[PDB]
Design a protein around this ligand. Structure first.
Ligand SMILES: Nc1ncnc2c1ncn2[C@@H]1O[C@H](COP(=O)(O)OP(=O)(O)OP(=O)(O)O)[C@@H](O)[C@H]1O
Ligand SMILES: Nc1ncnc2c1ncn2[C@@H]1O[C@H](COP(=O)(O)OP(=O)(O)OP(=O)(O)O)[C@@H](O)[C@H]1O
Ligand SMILES: Nc1ncnc2c1ncn2[C@@H]1O[C@H](COP(=O)(O)OP(=O)(O)O)[C@@H](O)[C@H]1O
Ligand SMILES: Nc1ncnc2c1ncn2[C@@H]1O[C@H](COP(=O)(O)OP(=O)(O)O)[C@@H](O)[C@H]1O
Lengths: 349, 493, 143
């Protein structure tokens, strides 16, 4: 028995000895239904399970649950029912199952996306709609089409433009069973020969789900300082080889990237590994600014006109994140001076 | 429940009881009917001194089980005389001895494995087999405790073993009030505590006090009362509490700030007011709003301009419970791989408080910058660039301030795009500012007009610290030459 | 006080006495009536030759306690014949011997421990012995 079929040496596999092999993978929906039916046999035999439970719903709710997690779920549900009974003819009921529903290892986690998706998305113009539409088309292509198992993409733009939120919003809507994020701020102090292992291990999980999606954000930090070109070669090679590896037969992927320095990447021969690329621009006209201000919902009509009468004349160039920072800061002044200070600050860029 | 004397652990205790002990107290016939095994592990983690062991021992007595036996990680690790397996076996020996002697209905035996982070390396196998293997003991329970949750390896966490986790954090105000009410019970019972003490005030004065500090405070107050009585029907009173009020670990110490804030601040002109007002606005924003849990800023300007004092002043006026300074003169001679650890550890503590502020000063000396051919450190630069955008765990807040005298060199390294906003601290640039500074300090007297007649003609360019140095030096002359020498020295700049 | 042969250490002695020993001289009934644990350690630091050990010994005689026994850091550190633990155990031998046999009324014993070499940037066994499952109320450790 082993979890690493690669590292066994050839000596044991030649015929006459250890002649057979098999793979025991994650069960699919029928397997899950059968395991659930197996584990709750005795309770239904003695009539402690209520009549409202329907196994076929748990069969479809628990995606990418392994063998042991189902048993754990049932045990936790029974424990919760007992506790409720004792008050801190009992019958485990649907509510306990819902409440109890454990963390799957190969499933989805909520805390990470909560951390990378902070204030959602606000449609302040055409570019946002265009980017969302392209993301949706890519997700559909990877889910339905059969001639393209692997699909890649790279979002890029100026600093403070709104990339990471867009990537997490595109990925989190796919409803794929397996979603994972590889980030540079989980590897503070690691050496290069540990970054390679971490990346490889993260990738070697997405090959064991019938669908998946992986996020690689801030590529420039995984490698770069321009006081003399200094970077790492090991990480660059392992990343350049992993972006064209194909999964085993019948499984599908989707790798979304991110970066703020496109020219440096172009020089290093990396723009030819990503299938396609997308641009995320900055605010460029007063009308976009007024749209964003109205959507956020901070200033009122009279302040709106006061700001418009001045801002409309010139054109501006400011990322969305900076506009959120400033409009948040100005609010702390007394109600008299909010408009004046906000206009002064914006005028300083 | 109050008899165990645990306060501030209502939710954690409730959930632990629900998940881990509901089965064992239910009538045996029904649980035998449903045929569900019992949990077989618990993992507690948090900052040191918050009440983990005192919870395990009370959980031990709650079930009316046998008294526990303890173990320590490094103590077991170093034994390599053939005892590495013997220790593991002997601990469980009694459990299986009684299981065979009676059977399945033997009473449960607890064992407490402290410092479990040491066993797991980023000895294990035998323990793991014994807790769950071909043979199993249905009459044991294991409780782990640790302070470094990350370094436990995945092997112990898969379901079926050490199935539960809980986090024991610093108490909030209600927890502190309850602990204080717990610890002074007996004295008030025997009427030795005076009638002037009000616990609700100590509840609001002791911010970010952990579990043990409150007990230490009470003991120190009692000692002071005794000492007063004996003169170097006694009653501890408010004065003893105030006098005794111990140095917290996650709190504010005045000594550092005394060292960096030496002579206050003098409003000699508009830029000072501008800087202070901007600091106040930033503090308010990071305190009140919930759409920006991280805010950064960088004060920069020419040498000898007055940066460190303003940063410290802004920090101290906030009133945040947790304040710290990461300065590069506490690391004389360290190698790079120790600077990284020191910085990481200074940051990793600010995440365990509901508010905080961290001041990074003299950036260019952390990197070891020297312009005779560009030499610097890459480990520190990377470890510092990653941390300036790390977001704190859910519901907490953080504010970082910077400092530097070489801006453009930083701009070349692509660092200014990590700091949200920047401020400028200018020097003295007109004779009026110079006269106002001289008057505010209050050193010279007629001599003011003598100085003005000459200074007013020209424009000057001199930092505030240098001016303080000159005006302090000239005073040692005899009285009738002071003004003359002050002019001479200044004219050399 | 002047019979102790110490001058220029009034403040330090007074503060140490107040914080560490005020409870050990008050009538036993009252201190038992309030339920307070006794302090279990001290730390004295300074430049060489300013009068530290002579204060430890004088404090030893102040309480009328049993005479102390001393140890040296680098001496203990090098011993790796399995006695790294046996030495530590036999150090507190007398206090352990008397505690289980006389309880509250035991006569407190002292030990004088270069503690900075041990703490490197053998700690754990000593730490457990001073405060572990067992907690002798008749020991006092001065570093
Ligand atoms: N349409 C939008 N697109 C992107 N972000 C938006 C939008 N509307 C509001 N936001 C908010 O703007 C912020 C986006 O910042 P983001 O995480 O994209 O930074 P970033 O571009 O990666 O920064 P940096 O270059 O400094 O690393 C989030 O707080 C998000 O909620
Ligand atoms: N308005 C003011 N702003 C700053 N410092 C002031 C002001 N008024 C008086 N001072 C005094 O000026 C001194 C400031 O020196 P400071 O500690 O800022 O040096 P620094 O800028 O860190 O030095 P360096 O550039 O050499 O590293 C303090 O002694 C402070 O009391
Ligand atoms: N409710 C409480 N929370 C935290 N500490 C408490 C509480 N009540 C009492 N204490 C005191 O805290 C001290 C230290 O607890 P300890 O068991 O050492 O925790 P840890 O092992 O995490 O340091 C104990 O000696 C105890 O008297
Ligand atoms: N008041 C005093 N302060 C300091 N040293 C004193 C005082 N009175 C006497 N001594 C001398 O100090 C010497 C002992 O110093 P010692 O305790 O060995 O220093 P250390 O504690 O650094 O080893 C004795 O020889 C004694 O004569």
């Amino acid at each position: 028995m082993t979890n690493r079929p690669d590292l066994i040496d050839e000596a044991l596999l030649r015929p006459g000895r250890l002649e057979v092999k098999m793979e025991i993978g994650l069960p699919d929906e029928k397997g899950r239904l059968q395991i659930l039916h197996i584990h709750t046999a005795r309770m239904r035999g003695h009539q402690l399970l209520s009549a409202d439970v329907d196994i076929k719903e748990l069969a479809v709710e628990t995606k990418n649950f392994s063998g042991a997690e189902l048993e754990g779920l049932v045990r936790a549900a029974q424990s919760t029912a007992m506790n409720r009974h004792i008050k801190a003819s009992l019958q485990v009921t649907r509510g306990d199952f819902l409440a109890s529903l454990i963390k799957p290892a190969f499933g989805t986690n909520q805390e990470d996306y909560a951390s990378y998706i902070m204030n959602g998305i606000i449609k302040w113009g055409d570019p946002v709609t265009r980017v969302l539409d392209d993301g949706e088309l890519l997700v559909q292509q990877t889910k339905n089409s059969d001639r393209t198992p692997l699909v890649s993409v790279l979002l890029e733009g100026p600093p403070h433009s709104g990339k990471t939120a867009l990537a997490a919003k595109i990925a989190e809507e796919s409803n794929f069973p397996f979603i994972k994020i590889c980030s540079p701020d989980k590897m503070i102090g690691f050496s290069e020969t540990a970054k390679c292992q971490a990346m490889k291990k993260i990738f070697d999980d997405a090959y064991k789900s019938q669908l998946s999606c992986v996020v690689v954000d801030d590529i420039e930090r995984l490698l770069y300082v321009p006081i003399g070109p200094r970077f790492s070669n090991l990480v660059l090679q392992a990343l350049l080889v992993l972006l064209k590896k194909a999964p085993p037969q019948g499984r599908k992927l989707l790798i979304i990237g991110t970066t703020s320095r496109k020219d440096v990447l172009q020089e290093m021969e990396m723009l030819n590994a990503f299938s396609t690329t997308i641009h995320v621009p900055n605010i460029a006209t007063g009308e976009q600014l007024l749209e964003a201000l109205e959507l956020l919902g901070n200033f009122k009509d009279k302040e709106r006109t006061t700001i418009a009468q001045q801002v409309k004349g010139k054109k501006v160039w400011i990322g969305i994140k900076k506009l959120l920072m400033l409009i948040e800061m100005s609010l702390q002044m007394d109600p008299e001076y909010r408009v004046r200070k906000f206009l002064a600050l914006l005028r300083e860029e | 429940f109050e008899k165990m004397g645990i306060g501030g652990l209502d939710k954690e205790f409730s959930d632990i009881f629900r998940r881990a002990f509901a089965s064992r107290v239910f009538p045996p016939e029904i649980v035998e009917q449903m045929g569900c095994k019992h949990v077989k592990g618990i993992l507690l983690y948090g900052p040191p001194g918050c009440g983990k062991t005192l919870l395990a021992r009370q959980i031990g007595k709650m079930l009316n089980a046998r008294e526990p036996k303890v173990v320590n990680g490094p103590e077991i690790l170093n034994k390599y005389v053939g005892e590495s397996e013997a220790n593991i076996r002997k601990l469980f020996a009694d459990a299986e001895e009684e299981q065979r002697r009676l059977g399945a209905n033997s009473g449960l035996h607890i064992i407490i494995f402290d410092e479990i982070d040491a066993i797991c390396k980023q000895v294990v196998n035998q323990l793991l087999s014994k807790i769950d293997g071909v043979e199993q003991l249905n009459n044991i329970l294991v409780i782990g405790m640790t302070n470094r949750p990350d370094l436990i390896d995945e092997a112990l966490l898969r379901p079926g073993r050490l199935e539960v986790k809980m986090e024991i954090g610093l108490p909030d105000e209600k927890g502190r009030l309850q602990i204080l009410h717990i610890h002074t019970a007996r004295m008030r019972g025997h009427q030795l505590l005076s009638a002037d003490v009000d616990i609700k005030e100590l509840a609001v004065e002791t911010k970010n006090f952990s579990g043990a500090e409150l007990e230490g405070l009470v003991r120190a107050a009692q000692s002071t009362a005794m000492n007063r009585h004996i003169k170097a029907s006694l009653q501890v009173t408010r004065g003893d509490f105030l006098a005794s009020l111990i140095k917290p670990a996650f709190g504010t110490n005045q000594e550092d700030y005394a060292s960096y804030i030496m002579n206050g601040i003098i409003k000699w002109g508009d830029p000072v007011t501008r800087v202070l007002d901007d600091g106040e606005l930033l503090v308010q924003q990071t305190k009140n709003s919930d759409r920006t849990p991280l805010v950064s800023v960088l004060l920069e300007g020419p040498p000898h301009s007055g940066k460190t004092a303003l940063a410290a002043k802004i920090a101290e006026e906030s009133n945040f419970p947790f304040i710290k300074i990461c300065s590069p003169d506490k690391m004389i001679g360290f190698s790079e791989t120790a600077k990284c650890q020191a910085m990481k550890k200074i940051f990793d503590d600010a995440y365990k408080s509901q508010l905080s502020c961290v001041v990074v000063d003299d950036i260019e000396r952390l990197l070891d910058y020297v312009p005779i051919g560009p030499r610097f450190s890459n480990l520190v630069l990377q470890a510092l660039l990653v941390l300036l955008k790390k977001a704190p765990p859910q519901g907490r807040k953080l504010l970082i301030i910077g400092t530097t005298s070489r801006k453009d060199v930083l701009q070349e390294m692509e660092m200014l795009n990590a700091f949200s906003t920047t401020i400028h601290v200018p020097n003295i640039a007109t004779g009026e500012q110079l006269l106002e500074a001289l008057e505010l300090l209050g050193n010279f007297k007629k001599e003011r007009t003598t100085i003005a007649q000459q200074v007013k003609g020209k424009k000057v360019w001199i930092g505030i610290k240098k001016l303080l140095m000159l005006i302090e030096m000239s005073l040692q002359m005899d009285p009738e030459y002071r003004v003359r020498k002050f002019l001479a020295l200044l004219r050399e700049e």
